[PDB]
């Protein structure tokens, strides 16, 4: 037999099976309802019109168990076709995700799932191990939800994780919006995932967001084309990186908030100034909102003007880091070590989902 492993994201489930190059299955975290009750995935948005949409894992922590349940169910089956209680069965959990939360996966893994052993990981933690690093800082930033994760000799520290409700989704909607401004219109759902095509193969990060500008708006050198699926053909300029520059300047979308720069060094200074530079010279980026391009040297630069001038710093930008979190379960889970660490299922009807507490 040979594991499992679910990563549950805000916007996209991956899973898979241990052991694995990548995950197996990659589909939208959505549950759709009024030839049948409930729709999860690809199916569930290609009949949204019929259906209720719902987004039970947004912002990175599960609010419907109902909704959650169906999602789980259609990855063992539907997507996977595993036996759950054939499969031990590790998922991923938010940071700060809170001890009622964790009891509930646990519960649900073993009751309605009957496994026969499962585990829950820290996202940021499994893209740490993913670049061979137990100690380090990580920004992960999905589709709903963005985290400063510090972590030390392989565990996180949860004092200093910092949280910010800004990633690929309100992107998105932003590269609409600026879009639409430009002289198109990019309002409805449909359209929605092709902005998001858009986003995903056009836009950048600017080193100088200033300097950018200003050349997008005297030299056509900044210009690309894009043909919608229509065969209509469609130039984009500073929208290209104005779009994810939002994370470095949320007041672009009407946030107080800091950007992804600021959290990150804010988030290293909550910690002791003794590993303080072993995060500096370990910033490791994980998730679908830091494929863009150039994100990497301007991390380098935005932290290098808030550390000390002697500060050696380092960002580390794996080319599969929009699997990060996912891979690194698939590393951990295939560990020889790890195998007493999963919570059995005799050790659940022994202790009951409090159990997690002392394994997880
Ligand atoms: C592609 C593989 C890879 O990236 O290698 C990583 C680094 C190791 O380097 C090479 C190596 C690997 C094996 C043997 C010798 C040398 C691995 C090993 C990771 O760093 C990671 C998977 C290790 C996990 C741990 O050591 C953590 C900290 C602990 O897990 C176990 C199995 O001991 C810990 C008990 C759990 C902490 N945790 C998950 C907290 O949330
Ligand atoms: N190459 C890319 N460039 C920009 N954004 C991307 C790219 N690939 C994926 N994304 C975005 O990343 C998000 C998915 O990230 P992911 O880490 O799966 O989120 P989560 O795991 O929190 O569900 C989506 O919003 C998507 O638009
Ligand atoms: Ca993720």
């Known amino acids: 037999t040979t594991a499992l492993v679910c990563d549950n994201g805000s916007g996209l489930v991956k899973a898979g099976f241990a052991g694995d190059d990548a995950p197996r299955a990659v589909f939208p975290s959505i549950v759709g309802r009024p030839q049948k009750d409930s729709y999860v995935g690809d199916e569930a948005q290609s009949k949204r019109g019929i259906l209720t949409l719902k987004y039970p894992i947004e912002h990175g922590i599960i609010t419907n168990w109902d909704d959650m349940e169906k999602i789980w169910h259609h990855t063992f089956y539907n997507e996977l076709r595993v036996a759950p209680e054939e499969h031990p069965t590790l998922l991923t959990e938010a940071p700060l995700n809170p001890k009622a939360n964790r009891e509930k996966m646990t519960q ?169 530079k072993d995060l500096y010279a370990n910033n490791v980026m994980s998730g679908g909102t830091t494929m863009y391009p150039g994100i990497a040297d301007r991390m380098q630069k935005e932290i290098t003007a808030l550390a000390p001038s002697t500060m050696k710093i380092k960002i580390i930008a794996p080319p599969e880091r929009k699997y990060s979190v996912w891979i690194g379960g698939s590393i951990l889970a295939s560990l020889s070590t790890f195998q007493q660490m999963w919570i059995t299922k005799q050790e659940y009807d022994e202790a009951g989902p409090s159990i997690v507490h002392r394994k997880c």
């Open 108 to 276: 649900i893994m073993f009751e309605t799932f009957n496994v026969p052993a499962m585990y829950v990981a820290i996202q940021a933690v499994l893209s740490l191990y993913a670049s061979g690093r137990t100690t380090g800082i990580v920004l992960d930033s999905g589709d709903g939800v963005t985290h400063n994760v510090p972590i030390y000799e392989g565990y996180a520290l949860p004092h200093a994780i910092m949280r910010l409700d800004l990633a690929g989704r309100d992107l998105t909607d932003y590269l609409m919006k600026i879009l639409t401004e430009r002289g198109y219109s990019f309002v409805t759902t449909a359209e929605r995932e092709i902005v998001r095509d858009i986003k995903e193969k056009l836009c950048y990060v600017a080193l100088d967001f200033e300097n950018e500008m200003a050349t997008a708006a005297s030299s056509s050198s900044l210009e690309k084309s894009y043909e919608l699926p229509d065969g209509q053909v469609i130039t984009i300029g500073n929208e290209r990186f104005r779009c994810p520059e939002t994370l470095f300047q949320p007041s672009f979308i009407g946030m107080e908030s800091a950007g992804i720069h600021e959290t990150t060094y804010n988030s290293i200074m909550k910690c002791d100034i003794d590993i303080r």
